[PDB]
Amino acid sequence: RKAGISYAAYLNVAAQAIRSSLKTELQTASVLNRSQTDAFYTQYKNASEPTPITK
Amino acid sequence: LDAAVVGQEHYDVASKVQETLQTYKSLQDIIAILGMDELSEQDKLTVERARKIQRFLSQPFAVAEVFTGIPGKLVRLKDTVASFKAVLEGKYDNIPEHAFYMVGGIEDVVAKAEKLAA
Amino acid sequence: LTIAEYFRDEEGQDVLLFIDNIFRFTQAGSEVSALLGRIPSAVGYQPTLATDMGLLQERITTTKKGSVTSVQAVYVPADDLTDPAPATTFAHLDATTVLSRGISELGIYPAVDPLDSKSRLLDAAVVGQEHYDVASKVQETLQTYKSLQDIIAILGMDELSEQDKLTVERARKIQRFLSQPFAVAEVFTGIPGKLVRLKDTVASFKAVLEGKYDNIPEHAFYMVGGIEDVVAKAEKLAA
Amino acid sequence: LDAAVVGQEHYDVASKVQETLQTYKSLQDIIAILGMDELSEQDKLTVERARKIQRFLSQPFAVAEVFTGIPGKLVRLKDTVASFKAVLEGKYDNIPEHAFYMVGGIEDVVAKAEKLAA
Amino acid sequence: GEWFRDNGKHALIVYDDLSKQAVAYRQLSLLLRRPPGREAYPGDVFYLHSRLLERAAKLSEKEGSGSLTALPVIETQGGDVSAYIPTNVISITDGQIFLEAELFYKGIRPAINVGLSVSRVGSAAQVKALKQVAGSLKLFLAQYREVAAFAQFGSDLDASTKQTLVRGERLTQLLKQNQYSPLATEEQVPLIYAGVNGHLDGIELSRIGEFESSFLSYLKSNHNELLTEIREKGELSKELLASLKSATESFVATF
Amino acid sequence: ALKQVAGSLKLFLAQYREVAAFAQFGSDLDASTKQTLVRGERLTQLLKQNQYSPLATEEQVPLIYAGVNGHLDGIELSRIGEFESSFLSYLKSNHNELLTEIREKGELSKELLASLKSATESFVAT
Amino acid sequence: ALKQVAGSLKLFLAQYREVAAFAQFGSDLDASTKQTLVRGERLTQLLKQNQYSPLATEEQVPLIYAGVNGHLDGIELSRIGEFESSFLSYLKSNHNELLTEIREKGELSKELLASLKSATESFVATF
Amino acid sequence: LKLQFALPHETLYSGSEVTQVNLPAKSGRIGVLANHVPTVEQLLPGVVEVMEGSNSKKFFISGGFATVQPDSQLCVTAIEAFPLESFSQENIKNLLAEAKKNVSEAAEAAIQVEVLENLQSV
Amino acid sequence: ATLKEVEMRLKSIKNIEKITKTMKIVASTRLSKAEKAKISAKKMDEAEQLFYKNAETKNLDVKELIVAITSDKGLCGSIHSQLAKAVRRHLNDQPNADIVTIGDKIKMQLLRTHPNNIKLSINGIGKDAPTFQESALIADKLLSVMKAGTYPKISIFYNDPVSSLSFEPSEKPIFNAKTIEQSPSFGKFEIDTDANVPRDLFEYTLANQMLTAMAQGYAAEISARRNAMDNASKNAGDMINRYSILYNRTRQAVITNELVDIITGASS
């Protein structure tokens, strides 16, 4: 997973599995909050610079 | 504005156009206090649709050309119904903000959206 | 007013006069005034709003021969307490009784609001330092209870400062204790009504305000008369 | 209040004082409800300046000595302009606001500012 | 209408509307130069309407038990119910049905504002069968108002209040109605019963209407005995209730 | 010659307050909003005018083209005053061609506007 | 005599009640004007009056002297009414010579001002 | 042995005395003795069995880290940890297996395969 | 002056007063939620930092990366402003740092003052309670687009929720792969020299301790919004009472004046 991702991502990828294969019966309100994010990122120079991609 | 008088399809379109626009007016104290980000994913969609709808009601009149410069457009009733139904059913959610504004029928809306590329 | 007056002047009683609704006495005065053709005054009321009130309210007083006490239903135009109608009326008021669907919705009868209702006579020189002191403390206790409800509703009963959970527990008692079964209401309720004499009321609540009956269950104080009926009721609750 | 009766220099000072005081007025309710914490940093500054300005326009009156408890001052027109020009130029932002309360000209502010030091 | 009321018969009178009559009354008076009052109405504009509306009454046994029931109508300006004439009449009648243009455009029709509407007679003149299933509905819709405009920005939803939104949106949608399509009470109670008892929480909102439809005719074909008993007794027995629970769930599952 | 440079200048100043009330509850400024706020702040400013001081139409026309077409946006808001007096003194010397053309024919050609495009860019770096 | 001991109390209280308005926090408890917040509550307490208790002008200035100058910033808020009756009785018996001089002079000489001063700290040490 | 089992969201064991903890370090299954040597090991996904004498609660684990302190403490830090009593009634594992690995996006869809076909090994 | 104007002013005030008195309660709905993720956060701090405590890990002195945490959502007293303070205070002792801003209000607070420094910016944040998935990806992008693991120092900035009534802007270090090795007591541990434990533990820690800051900063904010709306809806309530007097007067003088106008119109 080199020339590529990181230990923590590489760990989050497996972390979704536990949550998304816990029976819906108790996949809870707070539990789904953990399994998706709304975050975006925009790089900067001097005022803004490049594009605002999703995460 | 009665199904008996105008045809069921007509009235059904006309009513949802009002319901849609009544939601946008109810949501405005929210967007003012919590932005667009706070809206329900379906509310976000309904807000996006209403903007197009509210601009699709803009019409260049003929007598008005001495103000707008734009040639006066005249839309037929069946076009209108079929046009606002299409936009309701999400078939134009990709076409830009300005495209729907100050034109005639749905045909004209396509012409605006394209010419905003060159 | 005249009928009840006779009972003071001739039978020498303490008489009760209900007027329901006194505001309607004002708007009729206003109607007659208008029709006669008298220039209307502020907000359209009759130029004689105050003296019209006087010729009535003044007749309601205590004389050497007896008294006439008036319980007056007061409508308040537009919820505006400064409107000439209620403004004029209030000048003649010695107390208020506020029945409330807020109290009602708690199953507390009669539905008097213990905070809202007010008496120009809840004063040491009139009631005596005895009465007044229990009176204030009930009002202070029930008051801090009301203000803390926000945190009781979302932070649980657990998170009150050491003394506050004792006042709320006592306030909850006092709150129930303030309900009463009525003798008239029997034919709909079944529960035997109780005329609680004042001396008993003060003492019964003084006793609670000292915490002598902290142990006694809460459902007990509810729909009984004076203190003994709590003792009686609490002791049927084990059986 | 024209530049060609009072001087352009005199005119400009009072103008911006008014600008400032109208901005503090334009925010009065935002503040009264939500406090200083919800204001952009520009605004927050023009409010800190205007609050000084508003107290600086209050003056001990000779005839009002019985009410003030303070000796009465009679600032000169030329004095008044220069003083307020300086405050507009930011020269006295660090100084306590209360040093501006009930004084004469600019020198009285500093004179009293030190009285408020120790 | 009184001819009926006086002879042990029942008339319903609709005054459409008393806003316009009051204007007409003002017209005479201003023109006869009779003394004017607030908003130039005659000093007794109140009595014009209270004289009229007290004539609607239910009568004693000794007098025929005849009844005149009045449905007066007042138009408001911008919903302002504190206006001179509206308040006059609001204070005369035994209750309001306040309709709101807000709700109207939303699609909620009739646009009854549950908050500002009452029947001061209350239950005493509701079909017991209906009072049985329907009771406290107005109060739920009450708390549902608050919470819905408290979930507006509250995206944090405890299963308690979120579930209560579902009950709210369903009862609200059930109470929508086409014009000129009044229902019988024996059609109304089985419909409200399903609603209040959560049987509708599972069904998605867009199909509440088609539910009313299939459920009624299903009940008509299959569970007709229940409806007949609702109509002839206007009460619900514990057996009659059990039959209603069953037939609801029987249908709900099949659709 | 005024109508042409002043098209939708009123409708634009109308969409400017609309965005100024969006920034009233101060949030992040994007490609659209940070553009029109900075623009409209400078037109509002440009339409400030001293009393007892009317301007000829050949004076109004360049100033409005200067403002509307976007040659004022990178200039400090506080300096537009001196821009008015300075850009006019500049135009009176060199581009006197433009001003007496604009005065007389009252219109604008595709050629005249081309020269007005130049002169304004030609005075941007002082 | 009153005017002299009341020095900027009028102007003070309006300042205190304004300070106590910005006292909404809380997480920002000040050390500076927090002492005017004590004075205030002390002086507020002092001016409170039972109906039908009009005190003589001589019974007034000692109380106000104790407030203004600050011989009250230590005393608890629930015992200022006590301090009042306790301090009048004390003066009535002990320093009656002052109470008679205030009534008859109408002024306060520095000799009578320092005389009051002493009797104030004297009573403060004992409460 | 003392234990701090910590998650971002939940906090299972804090300070208390579990007698033996089993772990999945990289290429090493550790059963941490009551007095083990100071180690810092990376926890692959797997079962973290805590033994409290005659007891054991397994937890399937997202990943994380384990460190044995010089005071013989065990610090097991993970993202997700659930007791087996209600871990999984779904069974859309194979719905991800062939879904990921069959796509040649490329960098991470292939990366999401490596774990799933390993996770359900019990 | 006009009943219309007073009618509108009374409505927009009472409306504001619903907005704020509900955000006050939407906060308390979220208040218990805030203590879950708050202690759980401080709990892993005790668990995950105790290694570094024991390894005596400190900054190699051999160019900083500063990470500021707040939110996109305002109306929370001085959460944003006084973290910006403490970050500027810090930017005096080392001006040349790169700034990564998480949350839109700290972005523009800091964009006002040091617009050259900010070099990456994370959006759509304050909305829920913070998560590892968020953290880890922002972490991943920090490694990728920012080259975090080349920095002599890395700093996290957040507000630490001291009480329910007050908060405190604090700062914490993240040590990189090299810095973990050259710690004095790193040898005390029998880390298997095989895998770069120092690389992976850094990457894991960077993500892990951003989430701790996020969970904490989040909690303090909720309390700031609870308290700010506590004050706002009390001021608004106070305005309402005043204006309800002004409405009621204008209500009446408008009835009086119309009537005088009418009554005058028949003076003849």
PDB file of N, CA and C in Angstrom, chain E residues 30 33 36-40 146 149-150 153-156 158, chain I residues 18-19 22-23 25-26 29-30 33 127 255 259 262-263 266:
ATOM      1  N   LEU E  30     -73.369  55.462   9.022  1.00  0.00           N
ATOM      2  CA  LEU E  30     -72.604  56.625   8.610  1.00  0.00           C
ATOM      3  C   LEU E  30     -73.496  57.585   7.808  1.00  0.00           C
ATOM      4  N   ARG E  33     -76.151  59.519   9.607  1.00  0.00           N
ATOM      5  CA  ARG E  33     -75.395  60.373  10.526  1.00  0.00           C
ATOM      6  C   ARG E  33     -75.539  59.964  11.984  1.00  0.00           C
ATOM      7  N   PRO E  36     -70.685  57.619  15.112  1.00  0.00           N
ATOM      8  CA  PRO E  36     -69.750  56.571  14.770  1.00  0.00           C
ATOM      9  C   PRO E  36     -68.758  56.234  15.895  1.00  0.00           C
ATOM     10  N   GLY E  37     -68.206  55.026  15.825  1.00  0.00           N
ATOM     11  CA  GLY E  37     -67.192  54.590  16.765  1.00  0.00           C
ATOM     12  C   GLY E  37     -65.923  54.120  16.084  1.00  0.00           C
ATOM     13  N   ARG E  38     -65.242  53.182  16.733  1.00  0.00           N
ATOM     14  CA  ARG E  38     -63.991  52.604  16.259  1.00  0.00           C
ATOM     15  C   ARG E  38     -64.135  52.003  14.872  1.00  0.00           C
ATOM     16  N   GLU E  39     -63.220  52.398  13.985  1.00  0.00           N
ATOM     17  CA  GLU E  39     -63.235  52.089  12.549  1.00  0.00           C
ATOM     18  C   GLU E  39     -64.523  52.533  11.875  1.00  0.00           C
ATOM     19  N   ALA E  40     -65.121  53.599  12.403  1.00  0.00           N
ATOM     20  CA  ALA E  40     -66.358  54.187  11.876  1.00  0.00           C
ATOM     21  C   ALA E  40     -67.592  53.269  11.918  1.00  0.00           C
ATOM     22  N   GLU E 146     -44.485  22.098  17.761  1.00  0.00           N
ATOM     23  CA  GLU E 146     -43.267  22.522  18.462  1.00  0.00           C
ATOM     24  C   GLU E 146     -42.038  21.760  17.973  1.00  0.00           C
ATOM     25  N   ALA E 149     -40.677  22.224  14.334  1.00  0.00           N
ATOM     26  CA  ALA E 149     -39.940  23.492  14.213  1.00  0.00           C
ATOM     27  C   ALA E 149     -38.769  23.593  15.214  1.00  0.00           C
ATOM     28  N   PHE E 150     -38.505  22.481  15.904  1.00  0.00           N
ATOM     29  CA  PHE E 150     -37.388  22.327  16.846  1.00  0.00           C
ATOM     30  C   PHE E 150     -36.423  21.280  16.279  1.00  0.00           C
ATOM     31  N   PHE E 153     -33.707  22.678  12.762  1.00  0.00           N
ATOM     32  CA  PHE E 153     -32.261  22.759  12.794  1.00  0.00           C
ATOM     33  C   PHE E 153     -31.630  21.697  13.687  1.00  0.00           C
ATOM     34  N   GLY E 154     -32.447  21.061  14.521  1.00  0.00           N
ATOM     35  CA  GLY E 154     -31.988  19.934  15.324  1.00  0.00           C
ATOM     36  C   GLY E 154     -31.880  18.669  14.491  1.00  0.00           C
ATOM     37  N   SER E 155     -30.685  18.411  13.957  1.00  0.00           N
ATOM     38  CA  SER E 155     -30.416  17.184  13.195  1.00  0.00           C
ATOM     39  C   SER E 155     -30.061  16.017  14.127  1.00  0.00           C
ATOM     40  N   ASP E 156     -29.840  16.346  15.399  1.00  0.00           N
ATOM     41  CA  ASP E 156     -29.665  15.361  16.456  1.00  0.00           C
ATOM     42  C   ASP E 156     -31.049  14.911  16.907  1.00  0.00           C
ATOM     43  N   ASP E 158     -33.141  12.096  19.048  1.00  0.00           N
ATOM     44  CA  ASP E 158     -33.384  10.984  19.966  1.00  0.00           C
ATOM     45  C   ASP E 158     -34.592  10.197  19.466  1.00  0.00           C
TER      46      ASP E 158
ATOM     47  N   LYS I  18     -37.085  33.080  19.263  1.00  0.00           N
ATOM     48  CA  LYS I  18     -37.334  31.650  19.096  1.00  0.00           C
ATOM     49  C   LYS I  18     -36.052  30.975  18.606  1.00  0.00           C
ATOM     50  N   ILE I  19     -35.450  31.535  17.553  1.00  0.00           N
ATOM     51  CA  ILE I  19     -34.197  31.028  16.981  1.00  0.00           C
ATOM     52  C   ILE I  19     -33.174  30.736  18.077  1.00  0.00           C
ATOM     53  N   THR I  22     -34.078  28.181  20.989  1.00  0.00           N
ATOM     54  CA  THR I  22     -34.122  26.811  20.492  1.00  0.00           C
ATOM     55  C   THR I  22     -32.703  26.279  20.285  1.00  0.00           C
ATOM     56  N   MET I  23     -31.825  27.118  19.730  1.00  0.00           N
ATOM     57  CA  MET I  23     -30.398  26.802  19.626  1.00  0.00           C
ATOM     58  C   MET I  23     -29.809  26.597  21.012  1.00  0.00           C
ATOM     59  N   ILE I  25     -31.559  25.165  23.349  1.00  0.00           N
ATOM     60  CA  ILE I  25     -32.037  23.838  23.741  1.00  0.00           C
ATOM     61  C   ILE I  25     -31.497  22.729  22.821  1.00  0.00           C
ATOM     62  N   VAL I  26     -31.355  23.021  21.526  1.00  0.00           N
ATOM     63  CA  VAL I  26     -30.662  22.116  20.590  1.00  0.00           C
ATOM     64  C   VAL I  26     -29.224  21.862  21.069  1.00  0.00           C
ATOM     65  N   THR I  29     -29.813  19.355  24.124  1.00  0.00           N
ATOM     66  CA  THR I  29     -30.057  18.068  23.470  1.00  0.00           C
ATOM     67  C   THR I  29     -28.699  17.442  23.198  1.00  0.00           C
ATOM     68  N   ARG I  30     -27.784  18.274  22.713  1.00  0.00           N
ATOM     69  CA  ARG I  30     -26.443  17.845  22.354  1.00  0.00           C
ATOM     70  C   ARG I  30     -25.437  17.882  23.524  1.00  0.00           C
ATOM     71  N   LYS I  33     -24.485  14.259  24.827  1.00  0.00           N
ATOM     72  CA  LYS I  33     -23.693  13.777  23.690  1.00  0.00           C
ATOM     73  C   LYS I  33     -22.250  14.308  23.726  1.00  0.00           C
ATOM     74  N   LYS I 127     -20.736  20.089  12.021  1.00  0.00           N
ATOM     75  CA  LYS I 127     -22.120  19.624  11.937  1.00  0.00           C
ATOM     76  C   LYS I 127     -22.505  18.459  12.860  1.00  0.00           C
ATOM     77  N   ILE I 255     -55.731  53.635  17.231  1.00  0.00           N
ATOM     78  CA  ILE I 255     -57.180  53.635  17.386  1.00  0.00           C
ATOM     79  C   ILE I 255     -57.695  55.042  17.761  1.00  0.00           C
ATOM     80  N   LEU I 259     -60.153  57.597  15.384  1.00  0.00           N
ATOM     81  CA  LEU I 259     -61.449  57.974  15.907  1.00  0.00           C
ATOM     82  C   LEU I 259     -61.630  59.496  15.978  1.00  0.00           C
ATOM     83  N   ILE I 262     -62.271  60.722  12.595  1.00  0.00           N
ATOM     84  CA  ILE I 262     -63.652  60.457  12.183  1.00  0.00           C
ATOM     85  C   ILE I 262     -64.618  61.432  12.858  1.00  0.00           C
ATOM     86  N   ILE I 263     -64.532  61.502  14.181  1.00  0.00           N
ATOM     87  CA  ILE I 263     -65.316  62.423  14.999  1.00  0.00           C
ATOM     88  C   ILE I 263     -65.202  63.890  14.546  1.00  0.00           C
ATOM     89  N   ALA I 266     -67.257  64.924  11.376  1.00  0.00           N
ATOM     90  CA  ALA I 266     -68.677  65.220  11.564  1.00  0.00           C
ATOM     91  C   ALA I 266     -68.894  66.429  12.483  1.00  0.00           C
TER      92      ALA I 266
END
